[PDB]
Amino acid sequence: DEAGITGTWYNQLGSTFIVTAGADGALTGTYESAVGNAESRYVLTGRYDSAPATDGSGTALGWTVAWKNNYRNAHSATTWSGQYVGGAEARINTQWLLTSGTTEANAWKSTLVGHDTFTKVKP
Amino acid sequence: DEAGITGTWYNQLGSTFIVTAGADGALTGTYESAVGNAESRYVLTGRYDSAPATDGSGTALGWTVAWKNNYRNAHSATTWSGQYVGGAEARINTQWLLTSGTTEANAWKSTLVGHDTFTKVKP
Amino acid sequence: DEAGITGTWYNQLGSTFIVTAGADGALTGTYESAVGNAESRYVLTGRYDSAPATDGSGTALGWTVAWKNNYRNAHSATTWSGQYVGGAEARINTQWLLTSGTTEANAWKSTLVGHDTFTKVKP
Amino acid sequence: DEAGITGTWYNQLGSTFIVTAGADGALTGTYESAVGNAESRYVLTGRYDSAPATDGSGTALGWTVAWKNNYRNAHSATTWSGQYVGGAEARINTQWLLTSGTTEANAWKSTLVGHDTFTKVKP
Ligand SMILES: [Cl-]
Ligand SMILES: [Cl-]
Ligand SMILES: [Cl-]
Ligand SMILES: [Cl-]
């Protein structure tokens, strides 16, 4: 699912995930968020299972964006954890954790959680 | 906190996180889990805020491991999302999401969540 | 949104959530899961904001099921945390945490996380 | 673990959880948060496994607080999902989800996630 994963994906919010899946298990690309303290593209890196099971299961993967680029720094990072599901309507189904840098006093409210589903057509 | 982050870290379970923080915001290294369907080291990649706030807040970061190496493939990936907190007892405080590849029928039980705290001395 | 919330709801998996919202903020009812180690109905209790904002925001709420009834005991409990969104296609959008009782050794893999969306018509 | 659970508990933040475990699986009590948009006590309700396994596993449980009382309304609800672990240093180890009521536009940032550990002595 190297060929399955590589390309341009869009989530439910209208964000754009541009990724290359390497033969070695690497994910590399850019992320553009349609929401939050973000503008333009951000570097992403991650990993995927380059030898998934052949029993109809999805392909596990994850990636990170730190929300610093040449335009903005939101002092925060999101990780998406999920699986790719191949087929006519391919999907990447994820859950995510968005941690902000905080003082120790505020650390209890550091981390947002949510879920994004990515498709190969805007959605 | 490039110099702060780079090095060897240990969590509460006795896992080993070996990371290099690049000037450009990259995290690269290896992870060895003391638990689960894992043996030896696994590639990791991630990102961190290379220009954190200077108001006493932590440094946001995240990374991914896909649990495939030359020994084992657990058809799963974990992402850690958290912040580095500098000082005498430096810490990386994370929450994580562990997604397994599943059938669509089993996707509701695909994802474990937990929390790991890393220190520079075993802990 | 007492009248909005009270009634029968269905999620994406085909589970059935039967709830009464009390004037005092209580949620009481039964839950029937279409998946997992479950059969028939389970007691639920929870709470909701009985005086939500009037600026178009949702109504925050949560509830718990312990997966013990007269038929089965899965030694586990789920909590749903979310918001009710009123209107023609009313919805309750949740994220959930499913904790199993474990030994200390296995506690790192105790907790599943996911997301359920409930509608007033099967869905 | 009815007798184990019933009583006064304290988390790492200095919050106070006062609970009664009923023979029927109910949890009822009050919660006082040391942080956030909160003052004084809030109603809680939840559920626990009233017939846990006898193999050394913990007792699964969960509860909800809606953050409305006679003093304040934060238009939000937290659910804690976790397990009770009996013994000399009894503990309840939880993960939590704090959902705020939001507009649809802001729903992606509705939910905080974290972890609380409760002990029978301040901690
Ligand atoms: Cl959804
Ligand atoms: Cl902990
Ligand atoms: Cl979804
Ligand atoms: Cl902790």
From Swiss-Prot, chains A, B, C, D:
Ranges where the Avidin-like domain occurs: 2-123
Binding sites annotated in the UniProt record for biotin: 31, 42, 80, 96, 108
Key words, A-Z: Biotin, Secreted, Signal
Superkingdom of origin: Bacteria
Any GO CC annotation of this UniProt entry: extracellular region
Motif (Cell attachment site): 47-49
Coiled coil regions, renumbered to chain: none
Cellular location(s): Secreted
Functional summary from the UniProt entry: The biological function of streptavidin is not known. Forms a strong non-covalent specific complex with biotin (one molecule of biotin per subunit of streptavidin).
Subunit structure: Homotetramer.
Family that this chain belongs to: Belongs to the avidin/streptavidin family.
Protein name stated in the entry: Streptavidin
Residue range from the parent sequence: 38 to 159 of 183
